[PDB]
Amino acid sequence: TIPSSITSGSIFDLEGDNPNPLVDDSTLVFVPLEAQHITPNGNGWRHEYKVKESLRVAMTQTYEVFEATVKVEMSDGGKTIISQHHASDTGTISKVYVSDTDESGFNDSVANNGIFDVYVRLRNTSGNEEKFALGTMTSGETFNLRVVNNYGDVEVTAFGNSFGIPVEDDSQSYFKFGNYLQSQDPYTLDKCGEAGNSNSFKNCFEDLGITESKVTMTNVSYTRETN
Template sequence: MQKHSSPNIRVGLSLLLSTLFIGCGSSAESTKSETPAFTPAPTPTICSTSNPLVIVSASDEGSLDNKGPLNAIDGDTTNTSRWASNGIGKTITFDLGEESTIRDMNIQWYQGNLHQYHFAIHTSTNNLDWTSVLSDAHSSGAVAAFEWLELVDSSARYLRLTGSGNSSSALNSIVEVQINGCGSLAPQMNSSPDIPTQSSIDMSLWDNEGGNPLVGNDYVFDALKAQYVSPNGSGWRHELKIKKDLRVAMTEVDETFYANVSATLSVGAKLIVAQHHGGDTGTLVKVYIADSRESGFIDSVANNGIFDVYVRLAKQDGSGETKHALGTIQSGDNFDLRIINNFGYVSVSAFDQTVSQNVADSAGAYFKFGNYLQAQDAATLSNIENSADWAQFYQDANITQSEVVFSRVNYTRLFEQ
């Protein structure tokens, strides 16, 4: 698709960490470009240049159900909290509460890696008379995180974005907005505002394999105790999985899973702790904890008590998998894990690492988490195929501990696009 030219715009991916500081560049003359120029976030500076400003409220001309304007300023950067309005010329207006110098902003577009949004931005001191600070603009269509926009400097209290739909439809949709300049500074933003303080999942969505894992407010999985055997399996399981009548293709659902994962494991153990499974026997996303010699990870040494945490993602074209190292733990350690399926675009985060790609789809795909203890020799990587031999294998390998505890678990899903 032909990309529109973008006068006076620089778009850059800015990853939201503990506090997001944005520098200021002077306005440039209008240029014509087939592809938006990506630039790194400017060097952090004091308020005499540009910093995040307080946004006291937001309003619009009408939005879709449960996708009102306040969702764009609530600090929640997950797709479940977003503003959405359908139609060319729909607006969302942000009120800073006082007149400030507005210089640039950050926008996280809904499914920004899949759609290119078209828009214009105006500012005002009185919410009546408007000055253009960015016209005929479009998002990159390449990233699902924050994009940085340079604006014409203006003294204003209000900022209005007018949407002209996206490359696929007339939908305008924003996950989160930050406005930057000089004025009342916004408080520090949590880099993971959706991290729960305690577990919160709807158990009616799940079937269990190996018994109910809920212990107090945590979910405790022990495959050695449960000894659950499933068809086509490669080891004992103890897991929760989405019920069969709720399973849909990856491209039909927006899911977010978060948990703090603690693992007490014997040397040489290898297990899958979370996965998206296809409707058949194929697996689309697999997150492992493994003390094996499999190459390509941080340790990749068998039976030394250092467990690689990594993810395998099925390629969208079905040609195989990609594998990515996330970090390492020892028995008793814990780490934060987040998995997002954004209508087929999957992001897996742990140890301050995030890997993302469009994955293969499958009708009737479903998410599951827990403890799938592999019957695989850590040194030779040979599998024990016969389930009748698994007990002897674990005994011979001296694998006597396999407890995985999921704390502060949160799972959400959304079917609307």
């Protein structure tokens, strides 16, 4: 069953209340094309869980392990973030993607062919992002995800493939997971729409032909300790 940290919101705030991702006691369904929930400065719609502000400490002060069985159903050309760490100023620390773009450097890297690259970006201690391909999948396939933050040493495992490095520290860091559908052209990689304007993303997704986006998570666990 889904743990209380999520189902009672003891650790995680729900980002995107309607519909609720908890469809039964053992399943989370994330549908941002329905939730249509934004951040104040992002490009896209999300349906996700987020470690509440009142629990946040530094990356180097947290030990956390998130694990889930993850099924992804998404339109060709779609790009989503299924888990991520952010710094107090909103800055990216880690992001795990499932995307069907032509960004180079992954196993597929072919725009809009229905073969999704699954990869991770991690911000190293020098402030630079490093990226690593973990695998590929097609819409409707399932894989197992593990995200470990070992006091600032971040490791991501998908398809049994692992990559990890020490990341740039920040004072009030937080973890999110779910389905953060990015409003972004899979060819030029240009972001589309206007931050803070939900209606702008409606149109981006429409014209990009992104009308399918459902991430289903089961066998979910989350462990957290602070030092």
